[PDB]
Subunit: 108 residues, 4 copies
């Protein structure tokens, strides 16, 4: 079957969120995943949808899954591993936001 | 202090996601919250930001928090409680999406 | 088929965690669930496992699912709804723990 | 101050869950953490509690945090990275359990 409908979801969701030139050039690819629905690969600059889940997802479900992944991509940052001497990309979460807040209160 | 900057985040994030007329008319209000950063009240048609957290959040943090809440609002649905004889609004999550999939496989 | 093996998991997991007399008297019941694997009903004092998921779960999976639910039951508390004039049971989470911390810093 | 009360929580929580000889020999250490409350290090065989959070946590909070981490440790497994030619430890979650279920339905 065709994945023409999938590249259209990706593109109009990329535009909606207003992704910067670097994060905006991301392709979509159907591949079997061991333990997730979707997965972002920053080295490949692609998002993978689980080959086995996609045939059962509704249009609304796919649109939500993708917009949710890409939102976390949009507000993610790069950090230095130091020990591994490697660049590491970290996605945001409420625990990270709240721990940092309290941490900053304790520097005072 | 002024919350003029907060209503501007809300409005341009509402437009970005393309919220329908009903979900789009949502106001923002600073109020103390017992156990959350933000909280949507569908009867009041307002989103509350924790009075105590907001002074420490960055512009990027607020933009992400709000866009995350509103995304879950956008793809949420109403369901009948039956027992309580009341309307109930349910937000999406990966467990709900995957349980329904398997459930649908078992009707066959 | 028999659910004799299921009541044995429940009982030895209840004992392991050391649940108090009130929370300890909880029965287990196989029932179809709309959007979850397991679900605790405090009025019925029972835990429901999704009829459609259970045939595919391993022994280790069931043991983990149950121990995870019962742990959140063990450290949960009752709170007054005030508006609804009803008792409400709230399960713990990292957001609830961290929001309360910061809230307590702002009373000073 | 003393961390004698912390090693007592760890030990009786290790015994309660019935951790196997390998996972059971785990020490506890107070250290500042960038974005988490607690963190398990399998190479160091230690659990770290955030230096800045711990002074504000209640006895019940600490007991729950630790029992929650150690439960996910207990039902975690090792997997081969293949590409990195390294051993990787993976903690359980409902998405991993449900994705695997559907994946197994598609091998048929
Ligand atoms: Na655009
Ligand atoms: Na618009
Ligand atoms: Na006992
Ligand atoms: Na023991
Ligand atoms: Zn999220
Ligand atoms: Zn979410
Ligand atoms: Zn949990
Ligand atoms: Zn968990």
């Amino acid at each position: 079957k065709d994945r023409k409908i999938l590249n259209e979801i990706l593109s109009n969701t990329i535009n909606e969120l207003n992704l910067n030139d670097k994060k905006a050039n991301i392709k979509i690819k159907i591949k079997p995943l061991k333990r997730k629905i979707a997965s972002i690969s920053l080295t490949n600059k692609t998002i993978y949808i689980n080959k086995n889940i996609l045939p059962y997802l509704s249009d609304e479900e796919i649109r939500f899954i993708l917009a949710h992944e890409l939102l976390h991509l949009k507000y993610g940052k790069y950090h230095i591993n130091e020990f591994e001497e490697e660049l590491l990309f970290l996605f945001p979460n409420k625990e990270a936001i709240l721990i940092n807040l309290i941490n900053k209160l304790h520097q005072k």
